[model samples]
Target: PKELVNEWSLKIRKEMRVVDRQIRDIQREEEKVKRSVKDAAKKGQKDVCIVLAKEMIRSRKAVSKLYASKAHMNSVLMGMKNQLAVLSLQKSTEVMKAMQSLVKIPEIQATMRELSKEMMKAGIIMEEEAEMEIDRILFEI
Candidate 1:
């Protein structure tokens, strides 16, 4: 079980780097497109400017889509990490429940409730929400 989880985690990390690189590539292309549109406008080529502006709009949309995709990927990665933590916590809770006969402690049950609440709070940020938040932050920068 541990080996499988570790293998999956490694795969996720590899894919994450790929996504990161792709995002960077898109950014570079966006910059190049912006320059192309600016040059077209400066040359007073209205038709060329309009076409390039449309292309730029499309490119911007692509970048936004990719950003949202990466955000979802991040959400997936965080979900996996949360799963591991939840597994550990649940295992501990079960073990403590089993050992309740040996040790008289009501705190063990409370621990489970607290942990559950925390776990519930961990995933409140949806991918779309995260994407918008990131966009806002990047716009400010």
Candidate 2:
């Protein structure tokens, strides 16, 4: 599992570098081709100008295709992140029934009104202090 993940991560790193460099070079190469095409046009050299224009078109296609592949790969990576979050949620849901039961007991065990009445004179203050202390601990730890 770890091996597969690391392999893909490195694969993507190399993929980005190669495609990025490819587009960079292609852009500059097209510019140079355009310059030649312009020169050939001014000199009335139709054959060379036509060839340069064809090469420029092919390079443009390559760059656009590279971009689309990268865009799709970006979506694929986002899917990986989404599945990881969903897996964690699924793992936690396995224990959520226990949490539900704990909350279920409070009403049958004792109503909040009755508990409040019982705690008010002194117990409420004591419990409130403990609540504040726990909140402090939660903030720190």
Candidate 3:
């Protein structure tokens, strides 16, 4: 009845907005760490520089990781849009990829040593492990 796709897509749009914010957030932290790395180099703190370098390397991946997941969710949203236009359940295949990305995002935050867990804590339900749940949401209403 033209309900599920709208609601689901809207929800995904909201989720993607949060992801955008996370990307920016991580980039800012990376800048700060990078500045510290530079500071250490100037002070000739070789060992400390290496430690911060490792931290920067790891955090850089978190930004990439978010973008990777963001693109996948964008694809899923497109597929969901397709569901409304052409109407196929084929949109449901291997959604666990999105699910895993969805769950893994929490760890991205955790890796940051607690940036704003509260953002996600109240943002949206995980709802990742429930591909069937999406199908049900897509069906019969």
Candidate 4:
């Protein structure tokens, strides 16, 4: 029981860690996009600046969603911790140690490109539809 709870806690932390990495990457990408936008403005390239500004706006919206999700995740983790502490649950055995070891396995991050490739290989879906479907599903999640 104790190890199971610990596993759940660790899993939540792992998810948050992935989101943190994603947020970091988004910031890095945003910086590059912003630089391009600045260059476009300096060169008086109105069309280029307009397109890049749209990209920047889209990235900002994505970052906003990530921040909201992170806050929600933090709240959940706090609740889980509070409940576990209140219950004072404990289970003693070597079996829990083994389970803990198993729980340390890393999670896979599924991407649209990878899934599209696999789907094309299996003939389950066409190249065009795969990316669109994956993008739709990703946004829904």
What digit string (tens of lDDT, one per residue) describes model 3 on residues 1-141?
246557656766776888889889888897787677677677888777666665665676778888887886776577566656654334244443454455556733333222122212322117464434423322211
**Candidate 3 vs. true structure, TM-score:** 0.66
Ranking by TM-score: 3, 4, 1, 2
- Writing each residue's lDDT as its tens digit, candidate 2 over 38-134 gives 7777898867765666576567677887665555444434433443455221222322232222222222223323322322322211655643443
**Candidate 4 wrong stretches, greater than 4 Å:** 88-141
Candidate numbers sorted by lDDT from highest down: 3, 4, 1, 2
RMSD (Å) per prediction: 14.9, 27.4, 16.0, 13.5
Q: Model 3: residues >4 Å from true position, as ranges?
A: 87-91, 94-101, 107-141
lDDT of prediction 1: 0.49
lDDT of 4 by residue, 13-129 (tens): 677787788889989998787777677667888677666665666676777767665665555455445545655432323323323322332331333233223323422225565
Off by over 4 Å in 1: 88-141
Error of 4 at 35 (Å): 1.3
lDDT values for all models = 0.49, 0.48, 0.58, 0.53
* TM-score for candidate 4, residues paired by index: 0.59
What TM-score number comes out for model 2?
0.55
* Pairs clashing within candidate 3: none
The C-alpha TM-scores of every prediction are 0.56, 0.55, 0.66, 0.59
For 1-141, candidate 1 gives per-residue lDDT tens digits of: 334335544654565566567768878887786676667667877677566555655666666665554554455455456556664322333322322321222222233343234333432115555445433423332
